[PDB]
Design a protein around this ligand. Structure first.
Ligand code: NI
Length: 150
């Protein structure tokens, strides 16, 4: 759980700052970097993170602007990094406008299962962190300098 909105934003601020720093280092060339033959590229991993914000939060009913389709993938790393900045801002703006601490207990539907809003939010962070973990290997393999996390 998360008892409070500000408590979540202290966690969320570290996560977003860290993710944005990595996105900011990506080059257009690096986006083609692959996990393996026949597998996802770095560009797709990165756009999946961006699009995951509105997708994971959709069932909470908290409404804000943001692309939700992770295909096709942008070809410019500036679109991806800026996309993340944009949608994070719209998200955090909507949370601060519409929710107070009690809203974290409201039960909503997460793709079929009912869960409190706080679990949506826990899920957002965990998902993003898994995929950022992936990005770090691929960034290294693309010859980029990875800023640290944890
Ligand atoms: Ni995923």
């Amino acid at each position: 759980m998360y008892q409070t909105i500000e408590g979540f934003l202290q966690s969320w601020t570290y996560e977003t700052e860290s993710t944005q720093k990595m996105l900011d280092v990506l080059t257009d060339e690096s986006l083609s970097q692959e996990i393996a033959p026949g597998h996802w590229t770095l560009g797709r991993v990165a756009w999946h993170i961006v699009t995951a914000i509105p997708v994971i939060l959709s069932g909470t009913g908290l409404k804000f602007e943001g692309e939700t389709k992770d295909y096709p993938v942008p070809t410019s790393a500036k679109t991806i990094a800026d996309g993340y900045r944009k949608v994070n801002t719209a998200f955090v703006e909507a949370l601060q406008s519409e929710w107070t601490d009690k809203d974290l207990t409201t039960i909503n539907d997460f793709f079929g299962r009912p869960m409190p809003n706080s679990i949506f939010l826990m899920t957002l962070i965990n998902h993003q962190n898994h995929h950022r973990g992936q990005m770090t290997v691929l960034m290294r393999q693309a010859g980029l300098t990875v800023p640290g996390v944890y």
